[PDB]
Amino acid sequence: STIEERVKKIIGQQLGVKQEEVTNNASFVEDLGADSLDTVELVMALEEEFDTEIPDEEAEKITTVQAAIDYINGHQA
Template sequence: MSRIQDKARALIASKMKLDESEITPEKNIFNDLGADSLDFVELSMLLEREFNVKFTEDDTAKVKTIADLYELIEKYTKKTK
């Protein structure tokens, strides 16, 4: 697991009030972790702030799983380097 994924997992766990061990790549953010649309927007806001990136709505609309979220963050952090 990359450092970005480690940091993202800790942030997601904190935001969702879950144990980090529950944040695994295959988990669906909505169905498995119980996030609603506002949780997801707040999570995106937190990740954007912590990683200093700005996601597009088209990209966030495709996110379903934790793996999707890791991929999104990695794509955007590469863009800003």
């Protein structure tokens, strides 16, 4: 249950996709047509994760999935 691991999972809960549909470098506006619940779930997911409450500004450049792994990775370092 590595970083990206749990991450993907959470992300998979934010909407309800699989792994092949939420590939590491998965998209949102092109993948999940960018769902409000997604951008919102990102503010809660991260909040329920490490209480980081991701904004909408940093979420834009973090729309993807892998972006939610590189930012979370910060947990380690």
